[PDB]
A paper describes a structure:
Containing a tandem array of 2–30 repeats, pentatricopeptide repeat (PPR) proteins constitute one of the largest protein families in land plants. Each PPR repeat aligns to a single nucleotide of the RNA target in modular patterns, making these proteins suitable for the development of exciting new biotechnologies. Within each repeat, the combinations of two amino acids, known as the PPR code at two key positions (the 5th and the 35th) confer RNA specificity.
When dPPR-U8C2 was superimposed on dPPR-U10, dPPR-U8A2 and dPPR-U8G2, the root mean square deviations were 0.73, 0.99 and 1.00 Å over 348, 367 and 374 Cα atoms, respectively. Serine or threonine at this position results in a preference for purines, whereas the presence of asparagine is correlated with a preference for pyrimidines. These structures demonstrate how the amino acids asparagine and aspartate at the 35th position contribute to purine base selectivity.
Residue numbers in the entry: 42 to 43, 47 to 250, 252, 255 to 287, 290 to 380, 382 to 409, 411
Amino acid sequence: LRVAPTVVTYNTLIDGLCKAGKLDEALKLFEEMVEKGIKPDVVTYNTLIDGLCKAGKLDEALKLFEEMVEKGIKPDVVTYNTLIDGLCKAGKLDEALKLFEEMVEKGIKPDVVTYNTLIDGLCKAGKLDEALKLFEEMVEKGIKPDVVTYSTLIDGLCKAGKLDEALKLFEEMVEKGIKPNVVTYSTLIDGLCKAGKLDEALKLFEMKGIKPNVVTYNTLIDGLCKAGKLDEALKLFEEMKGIKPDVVTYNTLIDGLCKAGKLDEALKLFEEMVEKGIKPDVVTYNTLIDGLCKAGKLDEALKLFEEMVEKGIKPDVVTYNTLIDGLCKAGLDEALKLFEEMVEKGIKPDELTYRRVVEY
RNA sequence: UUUAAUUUUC
């Protein structure tokens, strides 16, 4: 191997490890390169900063930003976009809108991605009419709205129940010549399904030839289970081909079948999951722990939760919130014992976590 | 190197 390894090799390696998901491996290269005479650059800082935001170490991300500036490695548009996205997705919207101000004070033009990144945050922050302002502002600066832009607004409008305006934006997109893709059509197929418009969802799935992927089939499967067509969704899972089901496919059906009472069927799909080399994440165990609790069967729910940690999947706010619920409803001290444990392990409690225990 | 879609606690 060793030709002098560049910065670009360490930058490829560090990104690769960041996604994913051995972040601790990544940062020891970052050290190992600086001790070797190889100086990290703007892209080396941006990689790690995005790695650390995805792994939810946002506060540790801004440490590295501080460190770049100190070094006189200037943060560029990308560094700022990584930060603006990371802050939105950790719920720091107004922090993120600060950096949007600061970018311009430093002579950095905001981007197509910067506007996309912020229109997304705005939409997900229940602020649609600000999202549509930022969309008016790109055009004012002739930054061409693209397929990620339109797909985001459409998602936005659907998730606010504003379905017939999403449809109206999909039309506009095409006559304006930005072509939809699998993600466009599959947000819309998410829309229509969530508005009880299953026929319409399937009629959009027919899409030019955009090849549906596993997400579009998970949309329809979830659409079918919620509408109570469990065997039409077991059919589509068969299916109407070449798409390998993944972990969400099984969770969606595991939930559908739990809700229905078909706990036999579900658990065999959960047993089938692992035979086919699809590891059960935190949501598979969540979905069942709920099903078992609400079916009155709190013993087996707890079995599953112990087994969770016999395996490697670490619990969740949902895990604890669900068991908290079921434990209290199962006629308190243990519910409260789970709550202490949730604080030691490192998970932060949410409103419901509080709302339940209290309401003692 | 950075942005959009589907699953679990209603």
